[PDB]
Paper text:
A specific SEN biosynthetic pathway was identified in Variovorax paradoxus DSM 30034, which is recognized as a way to incorporate Se into organic matter in bacteria. The bacterial SEN biosynthesis gene cluster encodes three proteins, SenA, SenB, and SenC. SenB catalyzes the generation of the key intermediate selenoglucose product using SeP synthesized by selenophosphate synthetase (named SelD or SenC)15. In contrast to other types of GTs, SenB performs dual functions in two-step catalytic reactions, catalyzing the formation of C–Se glycosidic bonds and the subsequent cleavage of Se-P bonds to generate the final product.
We selected two SenB-like enzymes, CbSenB (GenBank: RYF17368.1; 65.5% sequence similarity), which was derived from Comamonadaceae bacterium, and RsSenB (GenBank: MBC7468551.1, 65.2% sequence similarity), which was derived from Ramlibacter sp., for further functional characterization. Like SenB, CbSenB and RsSenB are located in the SEN biosynthesis-related gene cluster. Catalytic activity analysis revealed that CbSenB and RsSenB recognize sugar donors like SenB and utilize UDP-Glc, UDP-GlcNAc, UDP-Gal, and UDP-GalNAc to generate the corresponding selenosugars. The catalytic activities of these three enzymes for UDP-Glc, UDP-GlcNAc, and UDP-Gal were similar, but RsSenB utilized UDP-GalNAc more strongly than SenB and CbSenB did. Mutagenesis assays confirmed that the residues equivalent to N20/T23/E231 of SenB are critical for acceptance of various sugar donors in CbSenB and RsSenB. Unlike that of SenB, the asymmetric unit of the crystal contains two RsSenB molecules. The monomer structure of RsSenB is very similar to that of SenB, with an RMSD of 0.99 Å for Cα atoms. The spatial positions of the putative catalytic residue K158 in RsSenB strongly overlapped with the structures of SenB. In addition, the mutagenesis results for the catalytic residues in CbSenB and RsSenB were consistent with those for SenB. These results not only provided two other SeGTs but also further demonstrated the universal effects of the key amino acids N20/T23/E231 on the promiscuity of sugar donors and the putative catalytic residue K158 on the Se glycosylation of SenB.
Numbering used by the authors: 2 to 11, 20 to 287, 292 to 329
């Protein structure tokens, strides 16, 4: 009496968020491998992480072709796995529909794959803006220490700013690359205003996003950073590396980009934002705030719910 939908994945994460969106009208179940026990009636498969879920994508195609099959793509899929893992790339060719997370994710793809790609922004409930002090600027960057996140840009910005005792930098992220972890420790040793907080639970990170004056996201590539959505929907504006995955989140006209790898430009934007605290002496910080507020409707849960049900309907 209800269509059976399988979500293949290895409350805020996509598999659970999408299961809750779909739970009203479909029989949804998350599963790690598709041909499982309750598979006999499935009409739709929504597969996350093509590389780890390729066997389940290929199992589906052997039974259905691309009928009812969609694959969701992140930055790891777009710029690493589909140019390196031939089974991962072939999952994209098996898919009926491909999903990217912001309106530039499709330009990373060849024309034959682009023509079956649609955009579905992630969503999160909005959070009321926190009160924040005007005697210091507190910046925050979030992401496990891997080279693709470019934490070395933030390390160098902290050093350039060591003469600015009214600017602070907090840094959340597990030290998955121990060399980058040592550099976090060295930066903290040499720059008292820089703090590496290590691996934090999701709820603590979400609250520190809300409490910071700004989020810095410096990555070399992105499929659509979850933490930029969280910041935008919490009243915390962003300083972002000017890469397609960030522009898709924040907009071609956004005033808060810096050239990727350019630690001097990041530091200078930090000094400018400090100068926005109070009639503010520098208008940039307020401008970033107003622009992010205009981006926030893109991440409303109701928009993603509606887009997901449209996808499932298209696939039935």
């Amino acid at each position: 009496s209800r269509p059976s939908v399988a979500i293949v994945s290895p409350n805020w994460q996509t598999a659970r968020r999408w299961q809750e969106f779909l739970d009203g009208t479909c029989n949804v179940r998350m599963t790690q491998r598709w041909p499982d026990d309750g598979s006999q009636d499935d009409v739709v498969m929504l597969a996350l992480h093509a590389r780890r879920s390729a066997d389940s994508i290929e199992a589906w195609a052997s039974v259905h072709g691309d009928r009812g099959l969609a694959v969701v793509l992140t930055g790891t899929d777009l710029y690493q796995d589909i140019v390196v893992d031939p089974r991962a790339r072939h999952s994209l060719e098996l898919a009926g529909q491909l999903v990217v997370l912001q309106d530039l994710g499709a330009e990373a793809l060849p024309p034959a794959l682009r023509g079956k790609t649609r955009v579905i922004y992630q969503s999160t409930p909005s959070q009321a803006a926190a009160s924040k002090p005007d005697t210091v600027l507190q910046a925050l960057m979030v992401g496990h220490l891997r080279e693709v996140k470019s934490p070395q840009t933030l390390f160098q910005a902290a050093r350039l700013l060591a003469g600015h005792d009214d600017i602070r930098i907090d840094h959340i992220g597990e030290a998955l690359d121990p060399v980058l972890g040592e550099q976090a420790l060295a930066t903290q040793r040499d720059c008292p205003n820089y703090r590496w907080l290590g691996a934090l639970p999701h709820d603590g990170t979400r609250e520190r996003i809300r409490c910071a004056h700004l989020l810095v996201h410096a990555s070399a590539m992105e499929g659509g950073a979850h933490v930029i959505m969280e910041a935008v929907c919490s009243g915390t504006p962003v300083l972002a590396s000017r890469i397609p995955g960030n522009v898709g989140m924040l907009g071609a006209d956004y005033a808060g980009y810096f050239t990727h790898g350019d630690a001097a430009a990041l530091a200078a934007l930090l000094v400018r934002c400090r100068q926005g605290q109070a009639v503010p002496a520098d208008p940039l910080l307020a401008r970033l705030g107003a622009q992010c507020a205009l981006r926030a409707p893109l991440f409303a849960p109701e928009a993603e719910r509606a887009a997901l049900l449209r996808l499932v309907a298209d696939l039935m």
